[PDB]
Design a protein around this ligand. Structure first.
Ligand SMILES: [Cu+2]
Length: 502
């Protein structure tokens, strides 16, 4: 296996606007096939990258900054990963979703608003080439990635992911670590062939001859872990406080992170922004598309090498020599200045200060069926993506969504547009629910832990539990989506339209 910790962690450069004035900032980002070396001992890997970079450039904006991004497809007309034509026109379709963005619907990256190279062909919901992000929302770590219908798992795996940070100047007074000391960590698992090329399965193992070829698989677990486009990298840090924006940009894999010197993380933020109170943690779970905004204090660890370790399995127990490792910090960089940063306990208002009336309660089941080839098709409420819309909240109203998961694993559920509150999780009798549809609880409700007392947009719905969240659907109306963020599930067919009506 590749030798761990021999390449430095790349820090993606911050994108510079093509045009900028007090009234508007305009960016251009072009999707290109490109080659980059992913590890010291591999030949360069062919990838698809935003501005030909993997990951894409980090975009940084202010709260309320009037931003435009023209996302362009300059990719080849043929894909390089295995396309399964039986699950759903040009072969290569792309569209960019700013994950976490409070965004007008035609700029949200709807799966059917895709475009081919140079916008030659566009999907039925395409309206515009240049996307608009008003950023009228809390400071937070967002990220952007491909969202095209039936191809998201392939386009994202090819390398189409990047970070986007909204800075709210009202938070500057908190003195959180900043600038060179505020570093995004985009984690992506991959399997790489000897010749350096990416490997993505063209079918399940044990391929019944009843399967199409290629065939979609229900989950992808990569053999190697990359951070910011390098396999098991190291980062040299100064012995002081750093802020890390940790993003899970993997197709399926969930991580459970810790530090091998027993140090703590101080969580300061979740998907939707700063938590009301900082939270000291020895470990945390991070499923696909979730973000943790954390401080690590290396002050007392000068000279040490500390591994950011992983204990979550993917298709099996973790292997101590490979996927149990994410990256290595080396506390060997001399201090450039006094550490004037802080790790305050009091960070922001509690979401619970809000007292919205509950307009509606929706009950949603995570289910599925089996196709003519014997494969599982995962479905939200047993509806297909193409079935008539059923999730139709009224603009400005607040709803409780009750997500029932009778399946064997966790599904990370993402709602577009909004961030929401976690109310509680409660275990139920699976067999009974499956036989009769009756929901019978086997224990009391459990309120969220501190890490989930703030705002979330992608939320783990564990097996054998009902998860309740509360969301206010606004400020925009229109057609969005909600879906599982295991990409292999999303593309077949665990995604539904969401109409916020006026
Ligand atoms: Cu799922």
């Amino acid at each position: 296996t590749l030798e761990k910790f021999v390449d430095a962690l790349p820090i993606p450069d911050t994108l510079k606007p093509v045009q900028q004035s007090k009234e508007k900032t305009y960016y251009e980002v072009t999707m290109e096939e490109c080659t980059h070396q992913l590890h010291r001992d591999l030949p360069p890997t062919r990838l698809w990258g935003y501005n030909g970079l993997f990951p894409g450039p980090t975009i940084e904006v202010k709260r309320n900054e009037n931003v435009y991004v023209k996302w362009m497809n300059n990719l080849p007309s043929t894909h390089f990963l295995p396309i399964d034509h039986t699950i759903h026109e040009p072969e290569v379709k792309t569209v960019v979703h700013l994950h976490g963005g409070v965004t007008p619907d035609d700029s949200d990256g709807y799966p059917e608003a895709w475009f081919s190279k140079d916008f030659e062909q566009t999907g039925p919901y395409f309206k515009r080439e240049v996307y608009h992000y008003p950023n009228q929302q809390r400071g937070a770590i967002l990220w952007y990635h491909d969202h095209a219908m039936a191809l998201t798992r392939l386009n994202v795996y090819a390398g189409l992911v990047g970070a986007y940070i909204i800075h709210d100047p009202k938070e500057k007074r908190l003195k959180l670590p900043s600038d060179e000391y505020d570093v995004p960590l985009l984690i992506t698992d991959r399997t790489i062939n000897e010749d350096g090329s990416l490997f993505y399965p063209s079918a399940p193992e044990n391929p019944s001859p009843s399967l199409p070829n290629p065939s979609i698989v229900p989950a992808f677990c990569g053999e190697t872990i990359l951070v910011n486009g390098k396999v098991w990298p190291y980062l040299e840090v100064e012995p002081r406080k750093y802020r890390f924006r940790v993003i899970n940009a993997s197709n399926t894999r969930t991580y459970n992170l810790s530090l091998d010197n027993g140090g703590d993380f101080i969580q300061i933020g979740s998907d939707g922004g700063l938590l009301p109170r900082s939270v000291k943690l020895n470990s945390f779970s991070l499923a696909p598309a979730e973000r943790y905004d954390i401080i690590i204090d290396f002050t007392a660890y000068e000279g040490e090498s500390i591994i950011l370790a992983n204990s979550a399995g993917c298709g099996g127990d973790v292997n101590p020599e490979t996927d149990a490792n994410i990256m290595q910090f080396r506390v060997t960089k001399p201090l450039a200045q006094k550490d004037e940063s802080r790790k305050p306990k009091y960070l922001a208002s509690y979401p619970s200060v809000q007292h919205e009336r509950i307009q509606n309660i929706r009950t949603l089941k995570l289910a599925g069926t089996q196709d003519e080839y014997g494969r599982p098709v995962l479905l939200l409420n047993n509806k297909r993506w193409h079935d008539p819309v059923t999730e139709t909240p009224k603009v400005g109203t607040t709803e409780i969504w009750s997500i029932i998961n009778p399946t064997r694993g966790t599904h990370p559920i993402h709602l577009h547009l909004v961030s929401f509150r976690v109310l509680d999780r409660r275990p139920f009798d699976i067999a009974r629910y499956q036989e009769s549809g009756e929901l019978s609880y086997t224990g009391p409700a459990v309120p969220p832990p501190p890490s989930e007392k703030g705002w979330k947009d992608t939320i783990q719905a564990h097996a054998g539990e009902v998860l309740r969240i509360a969301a206010t659907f606004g400020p925009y109306s229109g057609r969005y989506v909600w879906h599982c963020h295991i990409l292999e599930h999303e593309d077949y067919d665990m995604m539904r339209p969401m109409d916020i009506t006026d």
